[model samples]
Target: DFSITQFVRNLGLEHLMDIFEREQITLDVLVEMGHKELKEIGINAYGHRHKLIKGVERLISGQQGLNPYLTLNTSGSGTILIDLSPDDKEFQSVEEEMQSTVREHRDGGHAGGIFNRYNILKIQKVCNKKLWERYTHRRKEVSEENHNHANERMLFHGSPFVNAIIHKGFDERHAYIGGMFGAGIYFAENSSKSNQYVYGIGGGTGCPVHKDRSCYICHRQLLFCRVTLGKSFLQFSAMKMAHSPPGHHSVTGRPSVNGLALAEYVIYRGEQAYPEYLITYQIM
Candidate 1:
């Protein structure tokens, strides 16, 4: 006779024994229990559910080699005949394989495109590190400009842009900045229209004026307007409304040598705008 207490104790879930006893859960019931049923009986944790299921499977397999013929009396008063012998090793192997297959199917299966907390945390960490590096490089440029009186300041010294980019506390606001930049921007010809003109980062050609208009980031007014706003008044209005400027516009557009085509949007560090392109900006 399989003692219920001993079986539950062997599973290393002694705390669950009282609940099992109250719920009339025996070794036979445990063997038949699925993950949902186990959860319903308070084995809610994933690791615990895995352990109990494995334990039940191990118990059934361990009994097979010991007894030549085994009979299990079900709670429903039915008899399950399990024939076991040295000659039936092939059958035992098949049974073990089936149990393993079942265990894997139950434990490992999940709906597609679902990410666990660990995966989300890992992605967030990578994005945060990248933003931190960008912020630090920008900060260093501002410091270098302070020493050189001949050179113009790259960014406003005491603007909200400075606080938002480098000195901002690690909280929701910081996360918002990272998320805003990291997220892809889709620019439609008209906000109401279905057809998209361009899809890129930092509002493509429509980069808006910063809240602090005095900021040196937007000091090259005509270049900023020509690249972002363009010659058309309607287009400029559309761009102006669509591309609400960030805390600071570290990025600006560069025209080709002939000035007919925009070469790329360059990221500014100090006096010079570097070759880093923000995103693909097609004029269609």
Candidate 2:
């Protein structure tokens, strides 16, 4: 049912043999070349560019890529300590000393809870029941002449067949970018009881205000946080902003605003307070 040469030919690899030769794949070259081939097929590896470069670089370079000897005011007061092995007798007391130092830092609030700030994640758990209900509702409402929401609903409720095609497309058109691609996995978190939660688009929403105010659109399970860093508690308040549609839509159409939809969703759901705000959905 499958052939490697056919797949390689489809990918234009036959035409690009010279590029592969630079990074030749011999069975004996287990570490680098084989690893690169795995990536070329869209397999994720541990030491890839994002993980090794961006993630580790942030750990080592602090705020800026400067000399390791120097530190900045933003680098909260702390000592970098490590314990290689707790089971080793010679390293046991050294581990204890490191632990004690960390305890002191936490107790004194010398770290100022900066470590916890980065842990704020909105772990989206795809729900099958909710997704099915939503999809069915959307399909019922959609007509032959109108299909804007149809496309969106399908993407939100992903199909295995569709995703396989998407992977194939990536393998064909954007192989280099997709080579570093990783799988999308779904996970869940424990139940929570909270209201007046904050949400954000993160870096995703360059012009979120337009989407927030759109009448037909709705956003659920939203949260927003004040990204404060200075002593004065500077406020980067969520404001009503406008976004012109890309290209010709700029002149032909009016700009959109984004926050009102979220606010209206909150009000309609009667989730004005905490402990009553629950978002459970089905994936089908």
Candidate 3:
């Protein structure tokens, strides 16, 4: 049902129902909410504000309450490069873009609160020729299917088995299960969010169960990937989302919701992401 209480309950945020009903909050009203409006309505916790706002984004995606907000552009060039030379302008831009992406995530500390841990020790351009062609192949066709636009963005991903992923690319057959949005390749806008995984530090959101192992002296690596999130769905909470919903090319959780500090995208298939750079960093 599209009822206010049901919407709140569905997001696992039933705690806000009382004020919602008391204030006569409608789906229309909720769509206009952000941290400020939500706080003004007495929902002061930062976490709740995010959940409600992102939850409304779900409505924009044809979430049960309303018809989808059609006509939003969800297309791009799907532009990516391969077999890079350091002298190539695109290569330098790829390097610079990723370095700045990490640098901009300064609001939070790296490696779970160590102030210096987030510093970038090195950013290496990954040059895998066949992998690049394989990933790049058919991307144009897919983009054509989506009105000839590929909504590409540089996002971050980190995993424990570096060797397996860097060379082989991400395969759902071997993906870790019980993720926030089910088993799929995940990417994040926040560098430090993925840092938690690189160091095997965040086990809170159903992290992969671990065996005894050294921290490898705590130096961490995260992949800065060029991800194509076409016809994305706006997700607000966790469910067993093993694949993209029908009519959607990807699923993305909004930034700063569900106790997580930022946004993340999950793609069911490997081709949606091309790992462009390897970020090696540590506390200095």
The most accurate candidate by TM-score is 3
**TM-score of the candidate numbered 1?**
0.25
Name the runs in model 1 displaced over 4 angstroms.
67-69, 74-284
In the range 212-255, model 3's lDDT, one tens digit per residue, is: 12232456567888888878888777777677899888888875
Clashing pairs in 1: none
Give lDDT tens digits, candidate 2, residues 113-150. 11211111122222233223433443344322133322
Name the top lDDT candidate. Answer: 3
All candidates: TM-score: 0.25, 0.16, 0.57
The Cα error of candidate 1 at residue 158, in Å, is: 99
lDDT by residue for model 1 (120-232), tens: 00000012233445445544554454452222121111111322222221122222222222211211111111011111122223224643211223321100001111111
lDDT (CA) per prediction: 0.33, 0.23, 0.68
